[model samples]
Target: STGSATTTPIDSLDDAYITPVQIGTPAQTLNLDFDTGSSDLWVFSSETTASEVDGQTIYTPSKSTTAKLLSGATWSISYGDGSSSSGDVYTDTVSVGGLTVTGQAVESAKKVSSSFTEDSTIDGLLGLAFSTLNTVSPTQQKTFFDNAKASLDSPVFTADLGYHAPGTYNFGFIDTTAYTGSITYTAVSTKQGFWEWTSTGYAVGSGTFKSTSIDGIADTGTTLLYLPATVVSAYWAQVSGAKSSSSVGGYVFPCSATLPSFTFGVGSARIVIPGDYIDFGPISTGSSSCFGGIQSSAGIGINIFGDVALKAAFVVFNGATTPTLGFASK
Candidate 1:
């Protein structure tokens, strides 16, 4: 079976991407952040603490005839940024776009971090990462993609994230129209439970392509592109008046600076991210300093090709026995 869904950037800076999903019998529609960095399909539900419920929509399990409590099951997940949420589990009929899954484990949040509560745009995350990353206890559950792969026309899915625009998430098949030229394929390392792979190298704007190996994950949950300190420093050095400010804890530059486009290698393929995409919104409402969308992944240990990078290309998560990653200019 094939499934297609539409996604949109949550904030003005394309902070996160979200897609509408329907759960339960009558279908309680909720805008869920589709996170490839995690593997827990969690949501804000009737079980969520009353105080934790902000303006975001909540899923009511008691009102769904198809909802069944997965007794003795619980899950807790903390993201890379320290934000967190946890709760019990329930099996319910779930639908995304036109794809439907029966008895899908849907974790309901009983507690949520302040970051999630304050961000009303995200109800919860729909994890598409490997099931090995699943946080469920007693008996771990599979991700929606893993559970659906058996019936999928092909054991793969593609993410076509856009720049402050509507994009698509396709399951089972690739949308040829979503990309151009030939797709470059590379092996994926799932030992870390992520779409981990190595990028060939990179180039700063119109500079020469630096040949080296940079390992990273294609994480949609993250908002920015995180690279090695050296690469990030090299990028900032080209921008005038750019400085690493401890005050903001990131590189900031004059808003009028001429930013250069960034290019990275995917196997033999090259994906380019326009300079404007790297110029995130101003630090504050009236602030003249604009934060750089590409930052250093120092303590993180691994570089992350987050939305900033993924939005610039069409990425395929080929979930074969030895899963592979496909990238193409979009």
Candidate 2:
């Protein structure tokens, strides 16, 4: 069985990408964040209190003929940013693009933190991370990708994230046309429930690539690239007006500053992130102060190649016996 799907980014916020997914028999369409950082497909639902759900869409399981409650099952999750949600569980048919999986566990959110409640446009999160990280109580749940992988032509997916432009998350198969040059493959370590890998080293601006190895995760859900404090400081030092600002909660610099390019080494493959990309938009409207998209992962313990870095290349999450990550220029 072979199948594939395409996803597009939502307007305004480039923090996450959304894909249309169908739930239940008749098919209730919902825009969901395809997150590689977590492993539970959860949606806003009728179970949520009216006041808690602003303009967000809610899923009514009772209306879906194929919806089945999983008695005594519950799920709750917290994000690195402190956002969280909790809900009951249901089994239903979930379809993405044309790929469909029956009996997919759908966590229905009855309670959501202010972070989610305030984001009215995002209706749900479709986690693509490993099933081992699922939060379902009593029995662990499988993600839509995991449940449908058996029928996919190849147990792989490709993420083509772009900068303020439309991109795609291709399922099952890799589209050669989506990338340029050859894909450089590297081994991935998923023992921590993430697509974790190590970079041979990095360089700031036109500097030579350092040989310091850095371990990190490729997380689609995260908005910025987070590295070690020392590395972050090194990069910031190259900018004339750059400084660590508590007011903006990270490194900030003058919008007119001549930003430097950042390069990371994957074996012999070098992934370069342009200076303009590192200067994440302004901190406020009409302000010359801008936030650095690449910050220190001081307290986070591990580095994260978030949307800022991942969007610079075409990434393939290959699920072979020993999973590997393939990177290519876009």
Candidate 3:
């Protein structure tokens, strides 16, 4: 079996991408962020604190006849950005696109951080990373993708994110028409609980390719592309009026500055990031300086191939016994 769903950018800057998912017997539809960076399908629900809930939609398990509370089960998880949420667990029938799981763990949020309440566009998160990253306790839980994988025609899912546009999250089968040329597959390190792998190297604009392999994770939850400081510096240097600023917290430059495209290697294949994409957007509404979409990962510890990079290509999370990542130009 296979499934497909639409992913839409929630904001003009593409701060986050969200997909519609149905939960429980009668099926309550909620727009959730499909994050490849973490596990645990947590959501706002009737159990959530009244004050903690704002403009978000809540999942009322009490209304879903199929919802079953897990005895003595609980979960608490946080993000690098400091946003956090904790909740009790329940087993319920969940559906994404046409894919359905009978006993999917549905984490009902009892509390959520201020960031979550501030952005009502996201009702919760549906994690697609390795199940080991799941935060549920007493006994760990399997992600929706994991539970549905065995029954799929192929144990894989692919991401197609667009710039200020709609894309898709496809399960089981790779959509050959969605990409161009051939897919370049690379080994993945699932033990780390992420879609982690290494790319051949990178080049800045017309600069020669740097023949060093860089290890990073494919995190759809992240908004920007983060690489080594050297690589980031090389790209920024090509812009006429760019500099890292303390106040704004990243490399920023004139709105009209001439920017150079970025290139990275996947095996021998090269994926080029259009300079327009790196411009990110204005520092503020109507501001003249724009923040960059690519930044140094030094502060982040590990490099992140986030939406900025993913939107430029199609990525396959091949969940075979020996997992591999496949990249193709779009």
Candidate 4:
């Protein structure tokens, strides 16, 4: 079963880049990322020098005239990606689309490094993942959705990737319209922080590859899909000129020309991944060959089906209920 959440738009993309969901009313808009993996809404402020903050979307509450900041409290955070930032905590009335969230927890960065500074084509992340992974401490006591949920027209969070190719993250809601037919839900494996599952092997060009089971979490934080060696090899075997000369320990093939589709079974629902979707990254090593998608792994603990797989279907994680995942498409 799915939880009752609501969908909200972050902002439009500028030249393939997306701005974080804007906070504040017509007075001011602070762009931020809708990160499901964590909770805590932060923005860079005037106190932060230009060098301390680079390539990130900053929100100046003082200029808003109507903006308000909580006194005394300050916050500093770091991510598993080795990125970190420090800032003072404040309060503001944040808004996305027409939905208004008042007294929302907002962090204003005093300093940030170049990594946090690099632009991911978006301002900041709005964490909408599970609360267990939330960076916001209980002492601060408020999540963006915690305050904004009451004002929302619906109690669901939805993400529309149809517009943004790979897909855009949505917070506070899940839109059923983004998906087609009935959703296929799976139980959440408690092995790790990642949403994981086991692939019942792979099939390519009418051939079923055996002894190629893949087990790993389904991580939204990851941008690319990750697979094991056996599974990847089996996939490459089906491609006409596919080879294992990739530096990433994966296979590289032409973007076009006789490419075979791939199928992975997640329980009863079988997902068909197109060959074009497997075109990993457009990279060339030295002057010799170009590589296709399909990275390789040395029998790692986790195998991830990232945005590539996610793009083909609608994924739903029902943490509030029995910790299950529901997949569907439109």
What are the per-model C-alpha RMSD values against the true structure?
0.7, 1.4, 1.0, 5.1
lDDT of 1 by residue, 1-330 (tens): 999999999888899988999999999999999999999999998888889888999999999999999999999999999999999999999888888999999999999999999989998999999999999998999999998999899999999999989899999999998899988999899999999999999999999999889999999889999999999999999999999998998999999898999999998889999998898978999999999999999999889999999999999999999899999997
The TM-score leader among the candidates is 1
lDDT of each: 0.93, 0.88, 0.92, 0.57
> How do all the candidates rank in terms of lDDT, highest first?
1, 3, 2, 4
Worst 10 residues of 4 by lDDT: 8-17
Writing each residue's lDDT as its tens digit, candidate 2 over 1-330 gives 545555666654476777788999789988888888899999999999777899888889999999999999999999899999999999999988788899999999999999889987789999988889999999999988899887888998888888777788877888999888889998899899999999889999899878988999989889889999999999999999899998779999998898898998878888899887787768998989988989999999889999888888999988777889998887
Q: Which structure among the candidates has the greatest lDDT?
A: 1
Single out the weakest 10-residue window by summed lDDT for candidate 1: 45-54
Residue 8 in model 1: lDDT: 93
lDDT of 2 at 255: 87
**Where does model 2 exceed 4 Å of error?**
11-13
lDDT of 1 at 178: 85
Model 2 / residue 208 / CA error / Å: 1.1
Candidate 3, 263-300: lDDT as tens digits: 88898988888887787778988999999999989878
- Tell me how candidate 4 scores on lDDT: 0.57
Better of 3 and 4 by TM-score: 3
After aligning candidate 3 to the native by TM-score, how far in Å is the CA of 183 from where it should be? Answer: 0.4
Candidate 1 vs 2: which has more lDDT: 1
